Symmetry: C2
Subunit: 182 residues, 2 copies
Amino acid sequence: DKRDQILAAAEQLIAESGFQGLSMQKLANEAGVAAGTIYRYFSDKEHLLEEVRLNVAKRIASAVQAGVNDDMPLKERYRTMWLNIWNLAGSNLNAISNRVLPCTTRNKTWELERKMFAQVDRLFNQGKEEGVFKPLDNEVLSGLSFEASVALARKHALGFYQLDDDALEAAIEASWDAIIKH
Amino acid sequence: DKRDQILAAAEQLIAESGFQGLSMQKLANEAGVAAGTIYRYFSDKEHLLEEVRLNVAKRIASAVQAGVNDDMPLKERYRTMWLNIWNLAGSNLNAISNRVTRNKTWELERKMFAQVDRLFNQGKEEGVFKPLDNEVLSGLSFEASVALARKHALGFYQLDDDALEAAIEASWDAIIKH
Ligand SMILES: [Cl-]
């Protein structure tokens, strides 16, 4: 089964030179398969692209959630994921997803991707249940904390500022302030 | 206006295809000119691109700081900017900026956002804000406006008014001392 190999080649090419650039021929060349092999797995370029988006979302979700267990205290689960996000900066996953349609597909993709972040939801739900977090939708809590520090990571990896360990922990703490009740 | 036409065409191609779809041939064709005319008005693609970046940055800076008066209270300026950012989402201009360097370019760009720096410097000097770097303070607050606004413009998630007000307060919590 060459599906992952093809997705890996595809993702590399998209990271490199984007969605619209993708050639089925170079894909086959880079994946090391005949063109015909690609069509045994994907009906056409457009279906391949959707599978790429879903596959990138799945990898991000497992990277973000790596090392988390729901036994940890809330703040430690938060810190772990926050730091996993920081360490994704400069990766292919970030590169690809910073681009990502109609809205039959657009909403399909969005909905399928949300299901993949089950431990992020459990953190925010548990926090709200415990009276620790502000009572906002998990999408808002995510936007105020995790999703925003993608921005810090991005701007750090691109050189806009250097952050020492004291400074990083200060950033983690400040973002926690955004989501906790005061 | 011919120069400006080329610049607008450049920005449009970039909005559609990024810097990787910006070839001089494609631009000539998008602007309805010969490629020579491009070389005449900019010297080369690098210089065309620096002008695109500066143009786009100035327009973003203008939008971000619209209606901000330096004498108003700290939190009022904050709110105005947070909402200005929110309303950039889904725009033409945000598209082109998303897709877009020298030290001189960055120095010139930063000067355009001087009000944003004065907000953070004044709040730190007054003991209101956490003593962090302005880029970090901005990362902790206004980038929440960007993330939320994006998801919102895409039609992914809808924030009613009370929720938007709460989100503005929450992101203020990130940057103030407690
Ligand atoms: Cl096969």
